[PDB]
Design a protein around this ligand. Structure first.
Ligand SMILES: Nc1ncnc2c1ncn2[C@@H]1O[C@H](CSCC[C@H](N)C(=O)O)[C@@H](O)[C@H]1O
Ligand SMILES: Nc1ncnc2c1ncn2[C@@H]1O[C@H](CSCC[C@H](N)C(=O)O)[C@@H](O)[C@H]1O
Lengths: 333, 333
């Protein structure tokens, strides 16, 4: 509700919206949060500790306080609850994830999305000037950043999803493409009566972290290819899987689950399900980033349905959580 | 007010905040707004017109609807009031400004702000891989984008600032560094009794747009260097000037105004004055961008004061407007 000139002004403001993420990146980069654990400090004090230019660091912190990451009073900045995960002592430090989501690749590909809208759908290499592999094989520490980034990001949602998941008291859970086993581990710990099977590529399962004393006797691991087949289970789990795959592969994958699924069985597709409507939701921003990277797409509830039906399943219900992730529950149809 | 894990999740969300600006950039790039003037359209229809991939363009529009730039209903997107200035038929089209604020240079320098926090304060060339000149002299159309971008952005704030400015009914207004004269022109049109003098670099004044019939007999133009001296006036104006200059130059400039200022005279410093506090304000984001570009800084009311006093002026009051711009009013002290 505004005139054409105010429109322009509002759009100029929107165009600079990327600065916040830029500031967060810098803050996590220098690691100023660690020096705010003792209490509110001054730009000078924080600068000495970082160590950086005061007047400069100040202007970054000022913009971040707008997003309630820090807060200023009497010339001092304090770390807030929202900014807490910037601390290195955090169970799940946000640094790796922040540095990854704002990494050169994503930052660059997001910038060239205009070029990515081509009618024929250009590939990654077209837009970036290189292959994705060339990018990682060019800088070792960046490849390291994505592994750690992906690992911590998922680790932050696990407990929520384990408690929100409709899990049986006994039976077997197959985490299909479960990575290094983090989610399966959390699920086992939350439901003592469950057995678990981890499936993923050989090089991945070789680095799995399921072998903890408290879950001894409750898990096995399998090198496999969920495009070809998956293990039998009372409950199948597909987290951050389908969103990497085109439409037919997804059915192919879901079908592999249905094939080895019992009558009382269920498959849990866990992804950033995109809500219909015009309201803010992180699933939409993630979706944009997989648009920019020309690889992957986030789906809505109505979009998942056709895939379940095609796999001999019925999308019984989608279950929202306190995270961007939701659980699409499919049963034998 | 949240736990350490939710902190992480909230920070992951903040880290992706740049996607909105990326989407706006793409939307303005392809110019989809022009095809929404007839009414709500479908992603397919908009795609044919743009012309781009439907499923792709759809995902961009979806993210933009979150910022109320477009709006979806029954599979159709409509242009909203906030998005209106995306239309090419606008008095001040937002496209140039959007494309500039998200241009490669700013986008890149914002990304390397961590490197810019060095204790000794690195220069532009250090961080970008080139000089700023090399950048423009490397692409002609980008230099063209910044001129048009800067021109339209300022044009959008002029009428607001002309009406908000405390202008005498008669007398002479010197727009010191007034660019191509846009603001002075608007001021003249709003206050018929005023005379005006435009000062700027020779190459700039040579391209001034003050010569319109309706203000004949009311303006002259002067090639000059406000570092050395400015013309006598009942009212001096400095818009988007001081924020480019270090501290001493600014006093040097203000002093040049005071020198040729009458008893009843006043100097109007018009800039994105940064408000104290932790609340959102575009002056803070602009400030961050001049941090990233290693050139310029936005100031607060309390920061401007010392400069006025040092110039023989008294900062009488700062006057906020309906724009990010405010008017710091200095009088002879
Ligand atoms: N053809 C295939 N067969 C089995 N696993 C695959 C596969 N292609 C990819 N994957 C695995 O699927 C995973 C998707 S990303 C990791 C998802 C993990 N469940 C989590 O929530 O964190 C990757 O670990 C990848 O190694
Ligand atoms: N030494 C100098 N003397 C006079 N003008 C200068 C100058 N250095 C820069 N400028 C001019 O000051 C202007 C600042 S940017 C344009 C500001 C204009 N008043 C507006 O609000 O849109 C530029 O046009 C630039 O050409």
């Amino acid at each position: 509700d505004m005139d054409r000139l105010q429109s322009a002004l509002a759009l100029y403001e929107e165009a600079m919206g990327y600065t916040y993420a830029a500031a967060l990146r810098a803050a996590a980069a220098v690691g100023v949060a660690d020096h705010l654990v003792d209490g509110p400090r001054t730009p000078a004090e924080l600068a000495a500790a970082t160590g950086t230019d005061a007047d400069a660091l100040r202007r970054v912190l000022r913009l971040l306080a707008v997003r309630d990451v820090v807060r200023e009073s009497d010339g001092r900045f304090a770390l807030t609850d929202k900014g807490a995960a910037l601390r290195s002592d955090s169970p799940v430090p946000a640094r790796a994830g922040i540095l990854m989501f704002t990494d050169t690749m994503f930052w660059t590909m997001s910038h060239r999305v205009a070029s990515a809208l081509g009618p024929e759908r250009p590939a990654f290499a077209d837009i970036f000037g290189s292959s994705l592999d060339a990018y990682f094989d060019g800088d070792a520490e960046v490849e390291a950043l994505y592994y750690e980034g992906m690992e911590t990001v998922s680790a932050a949602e696990h407990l929520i999803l384990a408690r929100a998941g409709d899990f049986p008291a006994t039976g077997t859970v197959a985490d299909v493409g479960g990575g290094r086993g983090g989610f399966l581990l959390t699920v086992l710990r939350e439901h003592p009566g469950l057995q678990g099977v981890l499936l993923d590529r050989a090089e991945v399962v070789a680095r799995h972290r399921l072998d903890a004393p408290d879950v001894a006797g409750r898990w096995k691991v399998v090198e496999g290819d969920f495009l070809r087949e998956v293990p039998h289970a009372d409950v199948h789990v597909l987290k951050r899987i389908l969103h990497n795959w085109g439409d037919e592969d997804s059915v192919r994958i879901l079908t592999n689950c249905r094939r080895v699924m019992p009558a009382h069985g269920r498959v849990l597709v866990i992804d950033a399900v995109v809500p219909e409507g015009n309201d803010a939701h992180q699933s939409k921003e993630m979706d944009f980033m997989m648009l920019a990277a020309r690889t992957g797409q986030e789906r809505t509830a109505a979009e998942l349905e056709p895939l379940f039906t095609a796999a001999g399943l019925r999308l019984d219900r989608v279950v929202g959580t306190s995270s961007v992730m939701s659980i699409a529950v499919g049963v034998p149809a």
